[PDB]
Design a protein around this ligand. Structure first.
Ligand code: 7ND
Length: 566
């Protein structure tokens, strides 16, 4: 971080501030929810479009007090009208910009947007789950503005959910009712709310699409895997992630003690005692100490968060993940809804700033043993079999005698995204209804329009399409500008929100009404397919064999002697 980027992020927080009231109209409106009436307000986009905005709709009790670390509870209804013209606070988290803890425990809200409260027809409902490694993110319009999607005749709903330890503490003791995955349970409860209330905003509750990017894609997939949500929605879109990514699940039941100890707990390792301590701690303290929880061994083995989705140690009424994600795929109801999956063309560029701070990471590619799937690798990663498996990875990404920064980030594309996509596609094909899955490859590179995560990746002036680079063409953010209607950037916004709304409506992403898609023939992946085909989205829209396929089969060959684990 810079002093520089702490300062003008705050003045474009000042410009957000002013422009949010400027682009507001004095036209307010009331809507029906099964919990009572809510009061929204009409807003304008910098494209002179307009939409109704309902923010701060609670779908659960504020998870404070004795409700902390607990499954979400249905909220208390209200007579009169609830104010929904201003956003609530985000989940407690460390500001990636300022390094300071922000947000509140009082964060279980969703936001509803639509350009027409009274449409003539029941509209497709799109529900977005933000990423942020399960430790940051929000549904504020400074990061996730609905301004592009409201050009289309859909209803868009952005949800929040508990993050970090507050969302994902897990204790083994049945007595304590902290089994884990509270934040996933937040998502469940918000989905249920959406099914039972979207009609009152003009949305068709029989045509609901859930989508998310990163941890948000892992989350979307989890919502497709769990029994808790069966039939609640009808399409799913997984943007750069899924539930069987190695990073998307962790056994964290031992780390609550560690967190307590970091926070000053005195006493023995006892779940009851640890929980009581954690229950009284200041929220901002737990969240800031979270970054010290992972051990050296865990960081080496590529654990990406201390507290995240987990296999719950016992079942409860609200249990979301009763088994390993791979096992859940076997009977997943979401296996049988139309699905779109995709990745950017240089995902791993995202890890630039991490790489910059920890340059020695590039030496991991000397043997690549640390990137071998942990289920295949030995503990110390010194076994000859592990060296052999690492050599397969090395041959896939190391271009010279010595690995470089870019070899590292190319490998990261596969470890984190492409290889888990391939494993999911294949696992799902062995247990699916035969409903279609479509692949996209987002390959549109621009420096003229960006989003705040570009700063995170320290990609202020790099070349390639990094993880999260596509969000820019879906959502308004406080760094966005009005772009010329003729610009390559404006044309991509229309294409992206176009394909996403087309898929949401029909379960098929192709429309000849989309500019650049005339010669496109977008078929889904078949079980018999040996090479994946994808819509490559660049300045042109082109159906191509996935370029990453060779490297994908190379990773797959690590499982030659262990096919049962693939
Ligand atoms: B996605 O936004 O959920 C996402 C984010 C990150 O961010 C991290 C985490 C740890 C170290 C560096 C960057 C990683 C992944 Br994979 C996915």
């Amino acid at each position: 971080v810079s002093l520089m980027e702490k300062l003008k992020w705050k003045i474009k927080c000042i410009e957000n501030k002013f422009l949010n009231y400027r682009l507001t109209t004095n036209e307010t409106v009331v809507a029906e929810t099964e919990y009572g009436k809510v009061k929204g307000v009409k807003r304008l986009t910098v494209y002179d479009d307009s939409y109704y905005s309902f923010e701060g709709i609670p779908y659960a009790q504020p998870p404070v007090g004795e409700l902390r670390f607990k499954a979400p509870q249905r909220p208390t209804p209200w007579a009169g009208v609830r104010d929904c013209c201003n956003h609530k606070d985000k989940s407690v988290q460390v500001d990636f910009i300022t390094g300071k803890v922000c947000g509140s425990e009082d964060c279980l809200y969703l936001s509803v947007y639509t350009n027409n409260l009274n449409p003539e027809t029941k509209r497709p409902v799109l529900v977005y789950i933000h990423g942020g490694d399960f430790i940051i993110g929000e549904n504020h319009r400074d990061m996730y503005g609905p301004d592009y999607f409201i050009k289309k005749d859909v209803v868009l709903i952005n949800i929040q959910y508990r993050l970090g330890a507050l969302g994902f503490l897990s204790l083994n003791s049945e007595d304590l009712n902290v089994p884990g995955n509270a934040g996933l349970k937040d998502q469940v409860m918000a989905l249920r709310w959406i099914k039972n209330n979207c009609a009152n905003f003009g949305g068709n509750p029989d045509n609901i699409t859930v989508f998310g990017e990163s941890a948000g894609a892992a989350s979307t997939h989890y919502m497709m895997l769990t029994e808790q949500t069966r039939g609640l929605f009808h399409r799913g879109i997984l943007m750069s992630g899924n539930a069987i990514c190695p990073w998307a699940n962790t056994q964290c039941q031992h780390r609550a003690f560690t967190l307590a100890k970091l926070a000053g707990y005195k006493g023995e390792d006892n779940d009851k005692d640890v929980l009581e301590f954690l229950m009284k701690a200041k929220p901002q303290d737990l969240i800031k100490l979270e970054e010290k929880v992972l051990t050296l061994e865990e960081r080496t083995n590529k654990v990406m968060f201390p507290f995240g989705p987990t296999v719950e140690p016992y079942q409860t009424a609200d249990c979301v993940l009763p088994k390993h994600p791979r096992e859940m795929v076997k009977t997943a109801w979401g296996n049988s809804i139309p699905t779109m999956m995709g990745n950017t063309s240089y995902e791993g560029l995202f890890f630039t700033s991490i790489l910059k701070q920890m340059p020695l990471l590039v030496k991991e590619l000397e043997t690549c043993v640390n990137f071998v799937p942990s289920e295949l690798a030995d503990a110390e990663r010194t076994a000859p079999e592990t060296l052999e498996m690492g050599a397969k990875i090395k041959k896939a990404h190391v271009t010279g005698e010595t690995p470089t920064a870019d070899n590292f980030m190319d490998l990261c594309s596969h470890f984190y995204f492409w290889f888990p996509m391939h494993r999911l596609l294949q696992l799902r094909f062995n247990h699916t209804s035969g409903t279609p899955v479509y692949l996209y490859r987002f390959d549109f590179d621009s420096e003229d329009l960006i989003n705040p995560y570009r700063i995170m990746r320290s990609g202020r002036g790099v070349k390639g399409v990094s993880h999260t680079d596509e969000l820019t063409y879906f959502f308004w953010n406080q760094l966005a500008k009005r772009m010329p209607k003729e610009s390559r950037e404006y044309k991509t916004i229309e294409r992206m929100t176009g394909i996403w709304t087309q898929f949401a409506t029909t379960g098929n992403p192709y429309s000849n009404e989309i500019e650049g898609m005339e010669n496109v023939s977008w078929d889904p992946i078949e079980k018999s397919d040996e090479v994946y085909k994808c819509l490559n989205i660049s300045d042109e829209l082109k159906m191509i064999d996935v370029p990453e396929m060779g490297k994908i089969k190379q990773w797959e060959s690590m499982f030659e002697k262990h096919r049962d684990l693939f």
